[PDB]
Ligand binder design. Sequence first.
Ligand SMILES: Cc1cc2nc3c(=O)[nH]c(=O)nc-3n(C[C@H](O)[C@H](O)[C@H](O)COP(=O)(O)O)c2cc1C
Length: 362
Amino acid sequence: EKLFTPLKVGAVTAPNRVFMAPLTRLRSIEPGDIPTPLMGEYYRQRASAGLIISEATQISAQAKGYAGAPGLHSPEQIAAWKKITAGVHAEDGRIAVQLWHTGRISHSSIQPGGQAPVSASALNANTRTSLRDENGNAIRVDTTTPRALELDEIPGIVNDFRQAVANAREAGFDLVELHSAHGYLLHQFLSPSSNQRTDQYGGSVENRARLVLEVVDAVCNEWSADRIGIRVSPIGTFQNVDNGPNEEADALYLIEELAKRGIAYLHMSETDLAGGKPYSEAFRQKVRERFHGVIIGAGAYTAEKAEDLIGKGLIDAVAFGRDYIANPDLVARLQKKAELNPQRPESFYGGGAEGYTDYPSL
Ligand SMILES: Cc1cc2nc3c(=O)[nH]c(=O)nc-3n(C[C@H](O)[C@H](O)[C@H](O)COP(=O)(O)O)c2cc1C
């Protein structure tokens, strides 16, 4: 077993390879989309993780797509996150903030001015997002048809990612993870199914990957390459957004480009929660030879699958999502081969302490 051995991830060193995947829990304070003391406790309980990747966090108010999701834009949010990272560090843990712009996966009622959300093209995601009712309870709602950005708006998007990263550094995060997966803004440009642009940000894969690569360069220039991670879901269909008829080739192109920046890590979300086709060991090898940094695998990993792939040298770490939701001390449990607490899906989104901080440790 090598799942419990140290691993250098960019500027930091994780004592084990059991990572906590980014998990949207929608328990932030509104107004302000502010992280809470309860959230700090939740993250503190899970500090033994090799690395904690936070719930998706807004790089701007416009980036908001879910009620209850935190932001990292505004004095109050920065101050709130500072206490959370301090708590994790007090337990000697490491935490990375996942930054996103939901793009078309949003609703007008939570956008600035109540206006239509933005995207690569004006195509409704044909899905739903999570809002809050009159009592603050989480509820589902169809996504609002988006507005195609506009050429001169792109620089502003890259700037928002850069500023959020600057705030992240100030906030005490050890690393940042760009969310270019699961059909959110960056993925919306990457995919031809959601990108019908005729300017230089649409068409060829090079054009579709232009925005994400501009963000990587910008955040890398703002902080440091060894502080930047990125999550992608380039194979399969995620939240109604597929990856095109040449997804494999297009994925390898993107990874070679990311590699040139020498960033901290490549986080691959291998399948949608609804399932998907498995990654062949051949493809994993092709990814392996193209990226020279840490590679994190995620999906429906069992400790056994992780040990097998890490042992084949195809990946370096594994991010567990749901098991981490139900087991703050997942590291200890997996190492001791103990039983895990059962999961309570009903309380994954919204609410309070129940189903959040009440999962006991051994
Ligand atoms: C409650 C819930 C919320 C999630 N929120 C996020 C998130 O904020 N960002 C992200 O990239 N993926 C998110 N995911 C995906 C997880 O990080 C993870 O990849 C997924 O749960 C599959 O892994 P698992 O089988 O180990 O849980 C979410 C999944 C769940 C069930």
